[PDB]
C-alpha cells in the first residue's frame, strides 16, 4: 500500500513540468485521487482532484487553467500536467488517495489516508550555479573559557540542497547546519557551525566539506583563526 | 479557507481543543476531516465524517461538528503529537478546502535562553568585494525568536534574511540571521550588532570592522 | 387461614389490568415468543438493559426501540413531537462476520424525494472499517438532528438505504435473508425525557375528598406554634392517592422550639384501591 | 348521607396520634400558655418562621431548624442533640439590647467560658462588636457561633457557658436578660440550622395473625403468557390484608414490546407494595 | 518580628470583584481577629473591617472578608474607582505586638495593560576611573503601576547592591520605575554578564550588558 | 471625634523628638490607644500601645529600649517620646484610637478606628552635597523603531531637589526624570533620560543641565555615543 512519486525539478517561469505517482497495494481504478501542495514553510494547498476512470476533474482556482491532472488505470499511475508555471507554483507536491472507494457516493468528500513521499519542485529564472565556501572563523571574543562555536557560510548557490560535514564526517557532536535563506537574487545560502572547546583552536584541525550535487561542486575548507 | 488559530499548546497529559470556523457550503453541509503533519513528513489523516477515526488512531484523538464549525481535541497530550494540525472539508463550488493550520506545542522541557554569535565579514570575502555578517543563535527553548539588526544604534531593514527556528540533535531550536553589505558600508559604520529577542530577554552582540 | 389464595388469583389479574392501564395500552400485545426471538436485538444497548435485573400514576418512557417496518429499512413511529426531549438517537446496524480480513465500506443514505439535481439520497455517515474473520460488529451511528426533522414533517422520512462493500464494489449484504439469523436487523435506539372533591353535605360518587381541618388550640395543644391550624381532608377501598407536607413549628417540651418538614399530613387527591 | 360525621372525630383522634409519632413525642408536651408567652422569642428569625403562615425515612419528621433558650450570670445552653457538627449549616446567638434614652454607642462582647487556667482564666473570646443606638428603639443581634457550637458537640466538657457583655463608652451596664413582667420573648437564645436526620408488619402467607399485614405476592408474566414483556420475568408485587391498604409503594423500571413494532423501556410507578398500615 | 503577607498588587475592572489575600501564623491570624484597613495617597488609614468580618459604621457591604485557618480574605464586590488604593491586613500576634501586612496596590483599571519598557545602562567609563560603578535599569510606561525587578550577575541572583525606587504616574498617565545595582569595578570586570530582569503581570522582561563596551 | 497631632521634624541621628496628639469627642480613658508608622513609601508599621491608664505598654522591637509612649488622661493627650533617633526611623508617625473601649477584654486586639492626620518626622546624617554627574551614553541599547535613550546619572547629592534640563531647555520632548532613590549613606540618586531619534546622534549634541540649588552646583555635561 504505496504511493511513489516521481519527476520534480527546477524549471523556469512560463515553462512546463509533469509529475508522476504510481500505486500499489490496492486497487487503483476504485479510489478519487488527488494533489495537494505546500510551499516552503506555508500550509497545505489541495491543487485538484480526479475521478475513478478520468471522466470528471475538479481543480483549485489558483491553478484552474493551467494545471491539468489525470490518469492511466492501467499503468496504476496518477499524472499532474504543470503549465505557465509562475513562482508562486514552488512547493512539495503530494499525491494523494481517497480513504474511501468510488462505490459510495460523495467519496471525495471525506478525506484522504494515503499519500505519496512528496515531489519538490522549485520555480525560478536562476541558472545553476555552485557556493562560494567562506569561513566563520573563531575571533578572541568567544561565548566561553572553554568553547567557541566556529563555521563555514555556503554563499549564493542554487538550486538546493547542499550538505555540509565536518572533518570528512568524524564531527557530529556539536554541528547544526542551518536551513538555507532564499535571497532576492534567486540565490540560496547557508552557515554550518561546529560548537568547539576553544583550547583545541591552534592544533586540531577543523575542516568544512561542502557538497553540492547539482553543479557537480565539491569544496573542503579549514577554517582557522 | 476555514480558519484556525494560528497555534495552540499544552503540558504532557493535559487536553488541547484545536477549532476550525468555515462556511455553511463547507463545513455546514460537509464532513470534515483533519490531518496531523510532523516536521517535513506527508499529513496524516486523524479524524473523517466529523467524529471517527481510520485505522491505527487512539482514541484520545476525537472530534466534533456543531453548525459552521469543528474541534479536534487531543486528550491526553503526548509530546509527540507536536505538529501541526489541518482540518478540510469540501466547498459545494467544486474544490477541497484546507484550514491554516495551527502549531501545537507540547512543553517538554524549560525554558533555555539563546546562546548567539556574530561573526563579521571574513578577509575572503571582502576581498571578493562582498560583506555578510552572520548572527548564529543556538539552543533555545521554546523555538521562537525575533532578529533586529544596527548599524551605529540605526536600526537596518535592508540586506536582512532570517531562517526560520529549527530542532536540533540536541532537541533545543536554533536560528540564523544574514545582513549583506557592501564592503564601502561595512567600513563607514563604528560597529554593527545583531539583536535577538526571546520571551522579553534580550542578548546582543557587535562587531566592529577589523 | 387460606381464604387469602382464592381472592389471589383476582389481585392478580388485577395487576394485570392496572399494567396495561399504566402503559396506556388498551388491550395486552399478542406477541409469538417465536416473534419475540426473530425482533428482540442481540445487541449492547439491549443487553445493558436485560443484564441490569440478573402525574403520579401513568408510566415514564426513557428509551424506545424502532425495528424496520416491513427492502432495505424503513422507520414508522407515531412518536409525538419531542425533537427537544429527544436526547439521543442512534442507529444500530449488525455487520456480518467475514471470511477473510476484508475492508468493509459502508455508506448509510437518508431519501429524499428525487429531483434533477441531487437525485434520491442525502448521506448520514461513511465509514471504512477492517474486519477480521469469525466475529461481526455492531455499528451505532449517530441521526439525533436526522430523526428530528422526520418528526418535524412526516412525509420528508422515506426510510433509508444500508449500503456494505468491499475494495472492489461486490456487495456482501448488511441484510440477513435466514431463519438463523435472529436479532440481527437493524434497529432505532432514541433516548427521551417524558414527564374528585366534595362538599361536607355532598352526597358522593362514592370515593371523594372531604375536607376536614385539624385545630391545635382547640384540643389544647398550645406547644404548636405554627400553624394554629391545617387543612388535612379525609377519602370516603377509598383512600388517599396523593398527600402533602406541612411545616410545623412547636415546642418539643426539652426548652427547644424546633422548625419541621412532617411528610404526609396533608391529603390532595384520593382514588379507588 | 353523614356516616361520615360520626367517624369524623375518630379521624382526628388518628391525625393526633400520627402527628405525636412523626415528631417522636412518647406524649404531647405540657406547656401553659403563660410560659409559651415567656419563652417564645419576639425575634426576626421567629416572626419569619411564624409569618410565612399567612433505608431512607419518609415518615418521621424532619428538623430543620432548632431553637435553645438557656437552662437556668446566665447563658448555658443544653444540648441532647446528637454529634452531626459537619451538618450544622449555621448557629446564631440571638439578644436583644435594650432601648437606651440618649444616643450611645453599645459595645457587646460574647466569652466562651473555658476551664480556669493561671493566665488567660477563664474567657476566650467569641466575638466583639459596637453598636450605636438611638432612642426608643431596642435591637436584635445575631452573633455567629458555627466554630463555637461545633467544639461544643465535638468535645462535651468544653462547654461551660458564655457571658454577655453590653456596655456604653463610659462603662454603665445595660443588661441583655429580661426578667420584668412586661418583658416577654426578649431573652436570648441560640439559633442552629441543620441540615441532618435523613435516617409497619409483614407476614407468611400462612401466619396466623388478622392485624392487617403486608403478604407476599410473586407476579410472573410468563404464567401468563405476556411474553411481550422482556424483563423483569418476575417481581415481587405484595399485597396488604378506616381501610388496611398500602401506605408505600416502589416503581419498577420495565422492559416490554408495545406490540407496535417498538420495544420500550419505562419507569412503572407504584408496582411494589412496600408497606401496609391501616388507613 | 513576625509579619503579615499580602500579595504586592491586585487589579480589577469597575463593576467586577477583587480579592487581596493575607497569609500569616498560627500566633497572630490563627488565634486572633483580623482588621483591615484602606488608605488614599497621603491619608491616614480607615478600618474597613474587624473581627475578621464585621464592617464598622459608614462601611459599603460591597467590602466583605472572611478567616479560614492562618489565612484571611478581603474582597470588594461592585468595584467603583474611589477603591483604587492601599489595602492592609492586621492582627494581634502572641508575642504582644500588633502586626500589619506588607500592603496591597489595588488598581482600578481605566485602562488598558501596557508591558514596560526596560533600558539598561552599564557604568560608565567615566564612573569607573571613578572607582565606582553603577548599573541603571530604567522602566518606563507600565500600567497598572506595579513590578518587582531582579538582578543577575552572569545567571547567578545577586540581592547586595540592589536599590530600587516606587512606581511613579508620568504625563501619559502610565508609570515609570528605576533600580540601580552598585558594584565595586573589580565586580563589574569579574563576570561575563550583567542582567536586570522586571516582572510585570507574570510577564517578564529582561536586559543584558557586559564588560565587552562600544 | 477628633485627634489633632503635633510636633515632628528634622534631626540628627542619636537626638530626640516628642510627639503629641490631643483626643476630643470621646471619653478618652476609655480606650486603648497607639502609634502608628509608614517609612516614604513603604507598608504600616506598628510602634506600641498604651492601656486606658498608662499601666501596660508594649513596644515592636524595632523602638524597644528607645522609644517611649506614654499619656495624660487629664490632658486628653497621648505623647510618644522618640530617643536614639536613627535613619530608619524617618516616616509619618499617626497616632490611632482602639475601636473597643477597655471594658472588653482583648480591647486592643481588634483594631483602630480613629487616625490623627500624621505627623512627618524626619531623621538624616546627611550634610549638603552637589551631585557627581555621569554619562548614560545611547549604544546600540536604543528603544529600537529609530529611536535611542540617552541619559546622565546624578548621583550622591543632599538635600532632595535636584533639576535637570535638556539642551537649556530647548529640548523638552521624550524627556523623563525619574525620582530619587535614597541610599543608605543617605545621598539621593537619579537618572534622566531622553528619547531621540537614533539617526539625529553624531550630529545634533545632546546637554544636560543638572541644578542642584540647596548646594549652589550646576553641572553641564555632554552626552556623547560611545
New interface residues.
Given amino acids: 500500500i504505496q504511493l511513489v512519486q516521481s519527476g520534480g525539478g527546477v524549471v523556469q517561469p512560463g515553462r512546463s513540468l509533469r509529475l508522476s505517482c504510481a500505486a500499489s497495494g490496492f486497487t487503483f481504478s476504485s479510489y478519487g485521487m488527488h494533489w495537494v501542495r505546500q510551499a516552503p514553510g506555508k500550509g497545505l494547498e489541495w491543487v485538484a482532484v480526479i475521478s475513478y476512470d478520468g471522466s470528471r476533474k475538479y481543480y483549485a482556482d489558483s491553478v484552474k487553467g493551467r494545471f491539468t491532472i489525470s490518469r492511466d488505470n492501467s499503468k496504476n499511475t496518477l499524472y499532474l500536467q504543470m503549465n505557465s508555471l509562475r513562482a508562486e507554483d514552488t512547493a512539495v507536491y503530494y499525491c494523494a488517495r481517497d480513504l474511501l472507494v468510488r462505490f459510495l457516493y460523495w467519496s471525495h468528500y471525506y478525506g484522504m489516508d494515503v499519500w505519496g513521499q512528496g515531489t519538490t519542485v522549485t520555480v525560478s529564472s536562476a541558472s545553476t550555479k555552485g557556493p562560494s565556501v567562506f569561513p566563520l572563523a573563531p575571533s578572541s571574543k568567544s561565548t566561553s573559557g572553554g568553547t567557541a562555536a566556529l563555521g563555514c557560510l555556503v554563499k549564493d548557490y542554487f538550486p538546493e540542497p547542499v550538505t555540509v560535514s565536518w572533518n570528512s564526517g568524524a564531527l557530529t557532536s556539536g554541528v547544526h547546519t542551518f536551513p538555507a535563506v532564499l535571497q532576492s537574487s534567486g540565490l540560496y545560502s547557508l552557515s554550518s557551525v561546529v560548537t568547539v572547546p576553544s583550547s583545541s583552536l591552534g592544533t586540531q584541525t577543523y575542516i568544512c566539506n561542502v557538497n553540492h550535487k547539482p553543479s557537480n561542486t565539491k569544496v573542503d575548507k579549514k577554517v582557522e583563526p | 479557507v476555514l480558519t484556525q488559530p494560528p497555534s495552540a499548546s499544552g503540558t504532557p497529559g493535559q487536553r488541547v481543543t484545536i477549532s476550525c470556523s468555515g462556511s455553511s457550503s463547507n463545513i455546514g453541509s460537509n464532513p470534515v476531516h483533519w490531518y496531523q503533519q510532523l516536521p517535513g513528513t506527508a499529513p496524516k489523516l486523524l479524524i473523517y465524517d466529523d467524529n471517527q477515526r481510520p485505522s491505527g488512531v487512539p482514541d484520545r484523538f476525537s472530534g466534533s461538528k456543531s453548525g459552521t464549525s469543528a474541534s479536534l481535541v487531543i486528550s491526553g497530550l503526548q509530546s509527540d503529537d507536536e505538529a501541526d494540525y489541518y482540518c478540510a472539508a469540501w466547498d459545494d463550488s467544486l474544490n477541497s478546502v484546507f484550514g491554516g493550520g495551527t502549531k501545537l506545542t507540547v512543553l517538554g522541557q524549560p525554558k533555555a535562553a539563546p546562546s548567539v554569535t556574530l561573526f563579521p565579514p571574513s578577509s575572503e570575502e571582502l576581498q571578493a568585494n562582498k560583506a555578510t555578517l552572520v548572527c548564529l543563535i543556538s539552543d533555545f527553548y521554546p523555538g521562537a525568536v525575533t532578529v533586529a539588526w544596527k548599524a551605529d544604534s540605526s536600526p537596518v531593514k535592508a540586506g536582512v534574511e532570517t531562517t526560520t527556528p529549527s530542532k536540533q540533535s540536541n532537541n533545543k531550536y536554533a536560528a540564523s540571521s544574514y545582513l549583506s553589505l557592501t564592503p564601502e558600508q561595512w567600513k563607514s559604520h563604528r560597529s554593527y550588532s545583531c539583536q535577538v529577542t526571546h520571551e522579553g530577554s534580550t542578548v546582543e552582540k557587535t562587531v566592529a570592522p577589523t | ?2 381464604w ?2 382464592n381472592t ?1 388469583s383476582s ?2 389479574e388485577a ?2 389490568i392496572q ?1 396495561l392501564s ?2 396506556r ?1 388498551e388491550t ?6 417465536d416473534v ?1 426471538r426473530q ?2 436485538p442481540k445487541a449492547p444497548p ?1 443487553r445493558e ?2 443484564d ?2 440478573d402525574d ?14 416491513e427492502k432495505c429499512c424503513f422507520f ?3 412518536s409525538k413531537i419531542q425533537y427537544n426531549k429527544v436526547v439521543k438517537a442512534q442507529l444500530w446496524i449488525y455487520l456480518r462476520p467475514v471470511e477473510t480480513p476484508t475492508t468493509v ?1 459502508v ?1 448509510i ?1 437518508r431519501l429524499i424525494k428525487p429531483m434533477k439535481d441531487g437525485t434520491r ?1 442525502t ?1 448520514i ?4 472499517l ?1 474486519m477480521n474473520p469469525g466475529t461481526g460488529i455492531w455499528q451505532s451511528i ?1 441521526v439525533k438532528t436526522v430523526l428530528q426533522n422526520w418528526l418535524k414533517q412526516p412525509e420528508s422520512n422515506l426510510g433509508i438505504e444500508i ?1 456494505a ?1 468491499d ?3 461486490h456487495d456482501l449484504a448488511v441484510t440477513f435473508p435466514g431463519p438463523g439469523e435472529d436479532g440481527l436487523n437493524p434497529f432505532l435506539e432514541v433516548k427521551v425525557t417524558d414527564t374528585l372533591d366534595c362538599d361536607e ?1 355532598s ?1 358522593e360518587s362514592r370515593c371523594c375528598r ?1 375536607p ?1 381541618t ?1 385545630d391545635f388550640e382547640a ?1 389544647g ?3 404548636i ?3 394554629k391550624r391545617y387543612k ?1 381532608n ?1 377519602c ?5 392517592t396523593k398527600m402533602s407536607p406541612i ?19 396533608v391529603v390532595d387527591r384520593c382514588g379507588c ?1
Avoid at chain 3, 395486552?28 to 415468543?33: E, G, L, R, V, W
Wanted: aromatic fraction near 14%.
Fill in positions: 387461614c387460606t387469602r389464595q389471589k389481585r392478580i395487576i394485570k399494567i399504566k402503559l395500552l395486552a400485545p399478542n406477541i409469538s415468543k419475540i425482533l428482540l439491549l438493559l436485560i441490569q435485573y403520579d400514576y401513568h408510566a415514564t418512557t426513557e428509551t424506545i426501540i424502532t425495528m424496520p417496518t414508522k413511529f407515531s465500506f455508506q443514505l439520497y448521506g455517515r461513511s465509514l471504512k477492517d449517530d449500503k462493500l475494495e472492489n464494489g353535605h352526597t372531604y376536614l385539624v384540643f395543644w398550645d406547644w406554634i405554627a400553624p388535612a379525609y370516603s377501598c377509598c383512600t388517599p411545616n410545623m413549628l412547636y415546642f418539643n417540651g426539652k426548652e427547644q422550639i424546633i422548625y419541621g418538614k412532617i411528610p404526609a399530613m384501591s
